[PDB]
Design a protein around this ligand. Structure first.
Ligand SMILES: Nc1ncnc2c1ncn2[C@@H]1O[C@H](COP(=O)(O)OP(=O)(O)OC[C@H]2O[C@@H]([n+]3cccc(C(=O)O)c3)[C@H](O)[C@@H]2O)[C@@H](O)[C@H]1O
Ligand SMILES: Nc1ncnc2c1ncn2[C@@H]1O[C@H](COP(=O)(O)OP(=O)(O)OC[C@H]2O[C@@H]([n+]3cccc(C(=O)O)c3)[C@H](O)[C@@H]2O)[C@@H](O)[C@H]1O
Ligand SMILES: Nc1ncnc2c1ncn2[C@@H]1O[C@H](COP(=O)(O)O)[C@@H](O)[C@H]1O
Ligand SMILES: Nc1ncnc2c1ncn2[C@@H]1O[C@H](COP(=O)(O)O)[C@@H](O)[C@H]1O
Lengths: 650, 658, 339
């Protein structure tokens, strides 16, 4: 396998194009269309979508009904079809075409010298600035074939274009208004199998209309778990009554992959790599999507499937796609602030309920001066405040065995602080056992043991502080040890997020300037990754595994694109340059071997008996009662073997 | 509410009746039917099912086609209907009735002076000793109405008789052969709602046929999550070519509630209380049952529902049902022997897999001399033997704080044994914590108890790390139920729990079974027997009572007053019902309502509110009982932060003080 | 004619196999499947039924949704298909397979180098210890085809596999829970023609469950006048929350032909000679069975019949069947006392 090929990792390269319109001149439009398709071809694109009525112009009104115009459109269309014999992508081009009694507003799907199909617009707006039913017939409910340059090709609203060599790529096409009605053709098509939904638009621009386009193309792509590929008309359409902004865009399950300049000078393309495996993984897990199909079975079973062989380029063509280094940490500051606000209020409100339900017990917690326990102590405090409970009901413990930040934060917040040296107890235990992991574990164990007994003694509960990345990797001490508690507030927060939560608490500043300074000190001081690898890379793989179940080679491909060059892509706030590492393939490959071994084989038993705590990230959590049911007794051989066979050594 | 009324606890009393046949003489058969129905009424029955072609006799062949016979049947049927005005139960009576062109083999459903409906047999056997298509027409596909004594009443294979005051009682009726075809009318009727399936049979007896009847009525009742009420013809049928055994029976979800004497002299009845709530609870939970209905929706939606008001007796009429004292421990020795063999092989095979998967680590376990840990050590040994591992890889520990059976069993099995006294460590820990006892105070609270339980687990765990072993849990299912364990750092935690799915009441019989089988040898046998004798904490109540409630809650979700009723019927008299093997008379307690009520308050509080958090973070171990287990990854998903108020209030309002 | 050949007297030799499960490792499971299939071949068996989700392991939960796992299953399944080119028996193997939007819990029917069909479980328990709807889609009402290693093969709950040279052998396949609902797929298939009903089961063992299996597989075989061939998962399934007893069994019109050791150490097979003429003879005489089909004609006419040529061994291969000397006098004393 070619590891650097996007097509070999399930990507499909898609283009929404806005061409130069020459109204009433099909050969001119076709020439503009041919030039942009040759570009999409050079880019290795599999699909190029053009605007509504591309070949005539959308704005020409009663001129659509002129024989010479209709005739010119057919001739021009046929020329394009001929030219497509040497073009890689499927081209989806608008044309007014005659069929039976009328003309239809159609998209012609063209590929490698043939027309695969012809799709008529279903819903023809005849209100406000739109007059479409005057010239054109509704296509909803039309099936059968249409004759195009001596051949009968499939015609109708029930068509699916499936790549026989790219099973993840199933195209449905609809037109402009089709997307705006309470039950759009594209939503039935997704249920029936379509993964990529194209829209050819005219869409005269009005104040606020671009927002409406986005709202509907975006929600479509989220509701239908699909890529949505959208092209509107631009320069050249008539301005007798309307203006045109040429907007093009590509959405994937709710996220914007690419858009182009509004009101441009000259032609514009959006080009993106769509991840068919992402779409496939979401559909795999959301059972209710398939239930919805089954409830509408007669609607969804009636589609006709037109097969074609794409034969994509096999080499390196790069990756036209923003892959963030931190799935859990948005690079966009306004987004990351939102995430932090939500994470924090999840941890707090979850603890508050547990405390209300237990009639407000004291809160016992071991504070070491580290990031996790520090953050947990802040969570605990806010929870107690919110519930009108004295901060002295928090019992914080230093438990040194064989920092000041700890006692300072505690003092600054005004919780009850105390120290208990576990060394002598550990010595006694080591001796009694006749005594590495055991040495380490005897101390970790006695910490938990003490807290638990103090909790019994003082009418408290022990607060866990292990974080999501530690659960993922089994980096914790099971049972009698830090893995155990009465309630875990960090269980759902990945390590890479924790530092930004603390930053957010500081920046918000409701704990006061002292607390602020201590927390800032914790940060400066604190920033294991020796033996389990850098947490940036493990949190990366964790997301891919937990959200999508992607195979290891696909994970390596994504990580390498995100991390391999520190200069490319954006970093979140809070990364000075001395701390913007870049990773080689060899490194990514190494830590990924370690990740699959620890995640799939070693660590599950530790997750299996997990204390309570709230789920936090949309990426998922690792509760055996929630997002992650798995065997405690399984080997990781197949994952290790996949890496061995598919990921180059470096 | 009347706590002693079976009807108020969701029971329906049902009768399968075999009457005296007088072939060719409807008024005589009717008179036998009326006499048994008056009995079934006196018993407070809600339903009385009779045999196929009751009113004419099943065996009369072409005489069925004689007008005087057909006429006599109608007159006799109409007399019954009139008499039923003063009878409590719905009567289901067989009759050849004329409809359109032919006679149908039918069941007439009669209630309080009206005919509620008429059901024709669907499949008429015309092979071997059966000739039914010669005289009678197939009823499959017939709908509409039939005229009976001046009234149009529902006729067809699509009928459901629903009690308007007893929602759990929905009756469907089929006939004889109907139950034997690959897709029987009653299976569709169950999907559509029927909870009680009646079968009128003729069923000439042949060698082996009684077994076939049972196999099909039983599997029916299990697949359809229903009661199945079956009545065959007996004395009086013609013996020109056949004989008749009069068999009657009542099945409920796979279990036999009642059967009557085969080949009797005189009439016979089976009468049982059917638990509609048990049926309701199983349908509530088995989602795929409802999925099956949805898949056959056009079949299942077309049923016609005929409503009637039963108005059952409200007082104490007893409880015609065998309620076992020990849901987890069958009183039948052959049954209990089976259950033990299975429980034991479940425990062992589960541990073996964990051991194989961990490449055969040592097994660490704390042995106290008690029932649980003893049994666990036995389990562990057998697992190691089966995997061909040396018994010395089992590391057993005595861990005295502040027995010999323990060291003896260890020595007898040949596992590695050792002692570690946790006293000093506990002393140090109590002092470090500032607990009054480290200063001499005789304060033996939860912290004092817990410091010791904790250190036990803590030691085992560190030994496991040190010696490349895993810690075996030994807490049992009843302890998980009640939260009777020490959470987290304490006996609740381990690497693998073999007893997690076995209730306390079962454990002692598992040990007995291991002794009785005797493959560990006579020494081990003697030590185990000593553990039993020695070992046979009621702040949580008698485990017999809590295991009882646990089964009701975990399997059916029954309300507390229903549980009290059941437990009182099972436990209140030590002379009635059977005890399992191994209960000398000095140990056959009987409980009062007041007692049952007391321990039940404690059960609901502990089960639904206090203990879930301890179940929530549970080690791995195999499910054992069909009653269910308590793994939050398996049979029991529940909140760790809920109150038990409604349960406690239900007891307060519904269960008498004594 | 060869008087000593069981195949010439209307017998079909059938095997229910419980293999060594390696959870999450399809090439290992396929290797255990291939070894047992070679044995069934050497025995002259015409059919070998394996347990539910054979190729992945039944007990792996969310691991089923992992691309590497789904991928490994496909590669392993295609290796088996290739190996089957030299194997006599039809192989019925379990596999989680992707189709349309989801994965289905399926049985793949394999024969002489081809996949004859792919059958999805219809009813997916999601109660008590079972969580199937979480990972897998219900197969009831699915028809059409599925693409398996470059070919379109029949997919759905409506399939019959008929031996073109052994008219009495018509196979229907269902899965686990399918057999436990009031109106099971297998009862409509019998009405439609199936004489041999296979069941691939996971079936974690609980106290009393073995009795439930028997009651339902036995009553199914008696009600449907059929052979019922049943295989449950054993050693190697996860014991995170459940245990497994590896039970296999073969029923014929209400009678047990063969069963294997519960909780065995190592792999186990039941192997029996099913008498297709016996089944044929009972259906010939019990007219109400055909009446029942006619009453459900639209249900029963819709099945698709996939034809294959078995070409069984023609020589003496003995007779794996208890033939009592006295049809009228049972050799079992408890039974004879009853009679
Ligand atoms: N599948 C399975 N099912 C049941 N038991 C299983 C098991 N696999 C191992 N076991 C048993 O469980 C035990 C091993 O697990 P465990 O007791 O946790 O010990 P283990 O994971 O081997 O070691 C804990 C490690 O976590 C690291 N740690 C922990 C806590 C904090 C920090 C820090 O950053 O400061 C680091 C530390 O480096 C240490 O190396 C052994 O008894 C083993 O036999
Ligand atoms: N809902 C909830 N979520 C999270 N945490 C919760 C909680 N409710 C209490 N807690 C906390 O849990 C702790 C109380 O539970 P836990 O630590 O287990 O202790 P707890 O159940 O209060 O006491 C143990 C009891 O079990 C009996 N016991 C123990 C061990 C063995 C045996 C035997 O002989 O078989 C009997 C013993 O006599 C004692 O009465 C407290 O620290 C409390 O604040
Ligand atoms: N020296 C220490 N004193 C008190 N608590 C500690 C100390 N070291 C670690 N902990 C606590 O032990 C848990 C796990 O930390 P660690 O083992 O350092 O990753 C957290 O709750 C820490 O606060
Ligand atoms: N004296 C003891 N020696 C060894 N193990 C014990 C001892 N006491 C308790 N245990 C362990 O703790 C479990 C719970 O019993 P207990 O803690 O005594 O309530 C037992 O089943 C043993 O596994």
């Amino acid at each position: 396998m070619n590891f650097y090929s996007a097509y070999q990792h399930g990507f499909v390269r898609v283009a929404a194009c806005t061409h130069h319109t020459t109204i009433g001149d099909p050969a001119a439009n076709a020439a503009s269309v041919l030039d942009m398709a040759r570009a999409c071809h050079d880019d290795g694109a599999a699909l190029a979508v053009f605007p509504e009525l591309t070949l005539s112009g959308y704005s020409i009104e009663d001129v659509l009904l002129q024989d010479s115009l209709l005739d010119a459109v057919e001739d021009a269309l046929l020329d394009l079809v001929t030219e497509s014999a040497d073009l890689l992508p499927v081209l989806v081009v608008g044309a007014p075409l005659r069929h039976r009694h009328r003309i239809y507003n159609t998209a012609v799907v063209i590929h490698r010298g043939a027309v695969l199909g012809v799709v008529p617009k279903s819903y023809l707006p005849t209100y406000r600035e739109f007059y479409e039913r005057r010239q054109m017939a509704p296509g909803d409910g039309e099936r059968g074939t249409i004759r195009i340059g001596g051949a009968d090709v499939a015609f109708g609203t029930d068509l699916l274009f499936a790549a026989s060599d790219l099973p993840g790529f199933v195209l449905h096409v609809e037109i402009a208004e089709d997307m705006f009605v309470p039950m759009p053709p594209s939503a039935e098509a997704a249920l029936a199998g379509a993964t990529v939904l194209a829209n050819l638009s005219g869409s005269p621009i009005t104040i606020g209309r671009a927002e409406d386009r986005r709202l509907l193309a975006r929600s479509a792509s989220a509701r239908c778990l699909a890529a949505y590929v959208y092209a509107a008309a631009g320069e050249g359409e008539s301005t007798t009554d309307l203006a045109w902004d040429g907007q093009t865009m590509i959405w994937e399950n709710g996220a914007l992959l690419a858009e182009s300049e509004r009101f441009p000078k000259g032609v514009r393309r959006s080009v993106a790599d769509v991840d068919t495996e992402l779409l496939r993984s979401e559909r795999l897990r959301m059972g209710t999507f398939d239930d919805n199909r089954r409830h509408h079975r007669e609607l969804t079973e009636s589609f006709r499937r037109i097969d074609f062989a794409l034969d994509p380029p096999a080499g390196d063509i790069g990756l036209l796609r923003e892959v963030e280094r931190f799935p859990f940490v948005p690079a966009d500051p306004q987004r990351l602030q939102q995430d932090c606000y939500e994470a924090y209020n999840i941890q707090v409100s979850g603890l508050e309920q547990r405390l209300r339900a237990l009639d407000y017990p004291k809160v016992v917690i071991g504070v070491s001066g580290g990031l996790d326990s520090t953050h947990a102590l802040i969570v605990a405090t806010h929870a107690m405040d919110r519930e009108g409970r004295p901060r002295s009901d928090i019992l914080a413990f230093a438990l040194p065995g064989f920092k000041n930040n700890a006692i300072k934060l505690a003092r600054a917040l005004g919780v009850t602080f105390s120290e208990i040296d576990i060394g002598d107890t550990a010595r006694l235990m080591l001796h009694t056992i006749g005594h590495d992991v055991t040495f380490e574990n005897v101390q970790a164990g006695l910490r938990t043991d003490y807290l638990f007994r103090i909790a019994n003694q003082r009418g408290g509960i022990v607060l866990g502080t292990g974080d999501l990345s530690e659960l993922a990797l089994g980096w914790s001490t099971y049972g009698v040890g830090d893995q155990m508690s009465h309630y875990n507030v960090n269980a759902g927060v990945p390590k890479t997020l924790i530092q930004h939560l603390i930053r957010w608490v500081i920046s918000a500043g409701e704990f006061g300037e002292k607390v602020g300074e201590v927390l800032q000190s914790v940060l400066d001081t604190e920033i294991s990754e020796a033996k389990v690898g850098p947490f940036a890379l493990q949190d990366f793989s964790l997301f891919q595994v937990l959200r999508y179940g992607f195979r290891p080679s696909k994970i390596a491909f994504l990580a390498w694109h995100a991390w391999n060059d520190a200069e490319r892509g954006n970093w979140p706030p809070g990364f000075p340059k001395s701390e913007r590492p870049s990773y080689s393939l060899a490194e990514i490959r190494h830590w990924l071997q370690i990740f699959v071994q620890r995640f799939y084989s070693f660590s599950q038993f530790k997750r299996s008996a997990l204390p309570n705590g709230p789920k936090v990230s949309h990426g998922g959590a690792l509760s055996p009662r929630g997002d992650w049911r798995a065997p405690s007794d399984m080997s990781a051989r197949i994952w290790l073997d996949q890496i061995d066979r598919e990921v180059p050594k470096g």
